[PDB]
Design a binder for this molecule. Structure first.
Ligand SMILES: CC(C)CCC[C@@H](C)[C@H]1CC[C@H]2[C@@H]3CC=C4C[C@@H](O)CC[C@]4(C)[C@H]3CC[C@]12C
Ligand SMILES: CC(C)CCC[C@@H](C)[C@H]1CC[C@H]2[C@@H]3CC=C4C[C@@H](O)CC[C@]4(C)[C@H]3CC[C@]12C
Ligand SMILES: CC(C)CCC[C@@H](C)[C@H]1CC[C@H]2[C@@H]3CC=C4C[C@@H](O)CC[C@]4(C)[C@H]3CC[C@]12C
Ligand SMILES: CC(C)CCC[C@@H](C)[C@H]1CC[C@H]2[C@@H]3CC=C4C[C@@H](O)CC[C@]4(C)[C@H]3CC[C@]12C
Ligand SMILES: CCCCCCCC/C=C\CCCCCCCC(=O)OC[C@@H](O)CO
Ligand SMILES: CCCCCCCC/C=C\CCCCCCCC(=O)OC[C@@H](O)CO
Ligand SMILES: CCCCCCCC/C=C\CCCCCCCC(=O)OC[C@@H](O)CO
Ligand SMILES: CCCCCCCC/C=C\CCCCCCCC(=O)OC[C@H](O)CO
Ligand SMILES: CCCCCCCC/C=C\CCCCCCCC(=O)OC[C@H](O)CO
Ligand SMILES: Nc1nc(NCCc2ccc(O)cc2)nc2nc(-c3ccco3)nn12
Ligand SMILES: CCCCCCCC/C=C\CCCCCCCC(=O)O
Ligand SMILES: CCCCCCCC/C=C\CCCCCCCC(=O)O
Ligand SMILES: CCCCCCCC/C=C\CCCCCCCC(=O)O
Ligand SMILES: CCCCCCCC/C=C\CCCCCCCC(=O)O
Ligand SMILES: CCCCCCCC/C=C\CCCCCCCC(=O)O
Ligand SMILES: CCCCCCCC/C=C\CCCCCCCC(=O)O
Ligand SMILES: CCCCCCCC/C=C\CCCCCCCC(=O)O
Ligand SMILES: CCCCCCCC/C=C\CCCCCCCC(=O)O
Ligand SMILES: CCCCCCCC/C=C\CCCCCCCC(=O)O
Ligand SMILES: CCCCCCCC/C=C\CCCCCCCC(=O)O
Ligand SMILES: CCCCCCCC/C=C\CCCCCCCC(=O)O
Ligand SMILES: CCCCCCCC/C=C\CCCCCCCC(=O)O
Ligand SMILES: CCCCCCCC/C=C\CCCCCCCC(=O)O
Ligand SMILES: CCCCCCCC/C=C\CCCCCCCC(=O)O
Ligand code: NA
Length: 388
């Protein structure tokens, strides 16, 4: 039985290193959004709420975790607050991650009404609501779902604790049925699975829209070929009507509008000739469409594709951060499931408990790196802040 202060020293030093890095990186995130107007959008207000939670992991949750690792004598409800505050921050993180996913889904699925639906003032209200709900969820044990009514009196007496005090240890005061059914299953796992469903819908919507762009491009070029090798006016008419409906479908900005105005007008010109039975004249009119396709329509196609690809890239970055949250927190939740559901299993050893706690805390370090490596506007602003 090695002196407890030795393993404690390693755990505490690692926790302090994580707290430093969590504070520095996420202060840098908030500083960048504040300074750069190109970063001030609704998506990034949730990014700032998430960075604020991670700053508070460094400032408060990690000092609280160090404190509760000592088992110090405490009034049981004060111990509960120390134990549970990190659950507030994790819950707030989950709400921010879900909001970010939903924001990106609205932007990809209904871009025409995004800016009118998703506003900064509405985002700020949602963030406030989510922080209140996070306190209610994370501090639910302080409303009575706790083990303070059944203190471990033998452990309290062995530590010389006073009357009304307990040895402040997480699993002695926080009920494991709360931790597994309420905190994990209901408040963490279900939202993460909802996030997964939202991300699946985003990527499926992106895949469909790109396919629709390429299908309209092919339909344009196919029907031009049909007109060239048509042998009567009715065949020219058939292909032009399908081109005209497709042109309006791709129209659904001034040089954009001009290009489609020429295109639809040139289709109408050829359609009128077709309906007069002037096939050769209609086919010559339709050849003009190629100049418009080359000078205008292909540029719109390429720009639309480029916008969708950037949205896919941004949704992947957001999904990575949600996935890293799950990766860092799941081990601790899974261990709680073993403790709770398998009372015939030996408890996970202490070194593994503390490795899983450290891992969870490390999640508060990682997001600034994901933004730096994946989002140029963040990376460039970080550069300017550091250099200056
Ligand atoms: C706004 C921020 C900076 C203020 C931080 C206040 C924190 C540190 C305060 C608020 C309530 C406090 C707890 C309230 C009650 C108890 C029970 C006592 O037997 C031991 C200390 C303990 C566990 C306190 C520790 C410190 C504590 C968590
Ligand atoms: C900005 C918002 C979140 C305000 C934060 C204030 C919170 C952190 C403070 C304000 C008053 C504090 C409480 C005051 C008194 C007690 C009684 C004690 O037996 C257990 C701790 C407990 C319950 C404290 C926990 C922390 C507490 C709730
Ligand atoms: C989220 C991804 C990374 C998966 C993480 C799985 C981890 C948390 C799993 C894999 C193997 C698991 C261990 C397998 C067996 C035992 C022995 C038992 O007496 C206590 C729990 C304990 C020690 C488990 C704790 C949780 C555990 C370490
Ligand atoms: C998508 C995934 C990661 C969601 C989380 C899966 C969780 C809930 C699963 C993964 C492994 C599962 C555990 C595997 C083995 C045991 C030992 C058994 O004696 C009691 C149940 C228990 C403890 C399971 C509880 C639930 C569990 C922890
Ligand atoms: C409490 C301790 C941790 C708190 C961190 C709070 C970080 C919030 C402060 C950083 C603000 C950044 C921001 O979102 O500005 C953009 C808007 O101004 C656009 O209008
Ligand atoms: C997603 C959410 C998954 C929720 C499913 C939760 C299902 C749990 C049922 C259960 O555990 O009862 C068995 C008891 O004997 C345990 O002691
Ligand atoms: C996706 C969500 C998945 C949820 C899976 C939860 C399953 C967990 C259910 C475990 C029930 C159990 O372990 O009973 C054991 C008893 O015999 C007492 O030892
Ligand atoms: C304990 C409470 C801790 C933190 C409060 C949360 C602070 C979260 C700060 C986010 C602010 C924000 O995102 O602002 C949006 C913007 O102002 C819209 O116009
Ligand atoms: C916004 C920035 C402001 C900074 C935020 C504050 C930093 C919190 C530091 C430590 C919290 C842990 C403190 C809990 C210590 C309790 C130890 C104790 O009370 O020991 C006596 C007990 O009776 C056993 O005998
Ligand atoms: N089970 C658990 N334990 C602890 N700390 C106590 C580690 C421990 C466990 C058993 C023991 O005899 C002595 C120490 N922190 C913990 N934090 C969490 C947690 C936060 C979010 C999800 O799980 N679970 N959790
Ligand atoms: C991330 C960095 C990885 C390094 C992991 C080291 C951190 C914790 C495991 C060390 C074992 C500490 C035992 C805890 C003793 C106690 O607090 O009572
Ligand atoms: C991990 C941490 C990355 C921190 C990089 C250093 C930035 C410090 C500047 C600041 O605090 O704003
Ligand atoms: C520990 C908590 C620190 C939170 C860090 C967040 C920093 C970002 C924005 C705060 C607002 C800016 C304060 C001074 C602004 C100076 C200026 O704009 O010229
Ligand atoms: C920028 C402000 C950040 C706050 C700094 C806090 C750093 C202190 C860290 C941990 C405090 C641990 C207190 C130990 C509990 C008492 C042990 C015992 O009584 O047995
Ligand atoms: C900085 C130092 C943090 C102080 C933590 C001291 C408490 C250690 C006692 C213990 O773990 O048994
Ligand atoms: C502002 C930041 C204030 C930082 C406070 C730092 C540490 C608080 C922990 C001190 C508690 C030691 C208890 C002494 C004892 O138990 O005898
Ligand atoms: C549930 C907890 C209630 C919190 C009230 C916070 C105020 C937020 C109102 C703004 C709503 C919004 O603009 O969408
Ligand atoms: C419930 C008691 C504590 C609630 C504190 C929540 C803080 C509220 C809003 C954060 C500001 C977001 C803009
Ligand atoms: C811990 C369980 C949580 C309790 C759930 C019930 C309490 C919160 C309910 C609804 C919050 C909805 C926010 C409505 C604010 C007003 C909006 C507006 O004025 O436009
Ligand atoms: C908002 C919900 C959080 C309220 C929990 C604080 C209760 C304080 C106490 O137990 O004395
Ligand atoms: C909906 C979210 C808002 C929830 C918070 C509002 C009211 C709950 C307050 C309960 C008071 C805590 C006292 C607990 C105690 O002293 O035992
Ligand atoms: C346990 C659920 C795992 C999924 C975590 C969230 C996924 C987000 C990106 C895809
Ligand atoms: C390397 C870091 C951790 C890797 C795997 C975790 C597996 C730990 C299993 C130990 C069993 C504990 C026991 O004896 O009950
Ligand atoms: C103390 C360990 C913290 C390291 C977290 C890893 C963040 C990504 C690094 C590159
Ligand atoms: Na977080």
């Amino acid at each position: 039985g090695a002196p407890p202060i030795m393993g404690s020293s390693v755990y505490i030093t690692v926790e302090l290193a994580i707290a430093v890095l969590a504070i520095l990186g996420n202060v840098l995130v908030c500083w960048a959004v504040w300074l750069n107007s190109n970063l001030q959008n609704v998506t990034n207000y949730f990014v700032v709420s998430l960075a604020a939670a991670d700053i508070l992991v460094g400032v408060l949750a990690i000092p609280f975790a160090i404190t509760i690792s000592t088992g110090f004598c405490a009034a049981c409800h004060g111990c509960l607050f120390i134990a549970c505050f990190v659950l507030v921050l994790a819950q707030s993180s989950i709400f921010s991650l879900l909001a970010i996913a939903i924001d990106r889904y609205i932007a990809i699925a209904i871009p025409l009404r995004y800016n009118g639906l998703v506003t900064g003032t509405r985002a700020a209200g949602i963030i406030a609501i989510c922080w209140v709900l996070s306190f209610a969820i994370g501090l639910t044990p302080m409303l009575g779902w706790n083990n303070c009514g059944q203190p471990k009196e033998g452990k309290a007496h062995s530590q010389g604790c006073g009357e009304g005090q307990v040895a402040c240890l997480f699993e002695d005061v926080v009920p494991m049925n709360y931790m597994v059914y309420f905190n994990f299953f209901a408040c963490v796992l279900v939202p993460l699975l909802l996030m997964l469903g939202v991300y699946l819908r985003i990527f499926a919507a992106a895949r469909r829209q790109l396919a629709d762009l390429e299908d309209n491009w092919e339909t344009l070029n196919d029907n031009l070929k049909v007109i060239e090798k048509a042998d009567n006016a009715a065949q020219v008419k058939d292909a032009l009507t399908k081109m005209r409906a497709a042109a309006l479908d791709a129209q659904k900005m001034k040089d954009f509008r001009h290009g489609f105005d020429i295109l639809v007008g040139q289709i109408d010109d050829a359609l009128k000739l077709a309906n007069e039975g002037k096939v050769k004249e209609a086919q010559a009119a339709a050849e003009q469409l190629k100049t418009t396709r080359n000078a205008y329509i292909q540029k719109y196609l390429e720009r639309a594709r480029s916008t969708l690809q950037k949205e896919v890239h941004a949704a992947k970055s957001a999904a990575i951060i949600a996935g890293l949250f799950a990766l860092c927190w799941l081990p601790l939740h899974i261990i709680n499931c073993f403790t709770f559901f398998c009372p015939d299993c030996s408890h996970a050893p202490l070194w593994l408990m503390y490795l899983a706690i450290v891992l969870a805390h490390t999640n508060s370090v990682v997001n600034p790196f994901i933004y730096a490596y994946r989002i140029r506007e963040f990376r460039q602003t970080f550069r300017k802040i550091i250099r200056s």
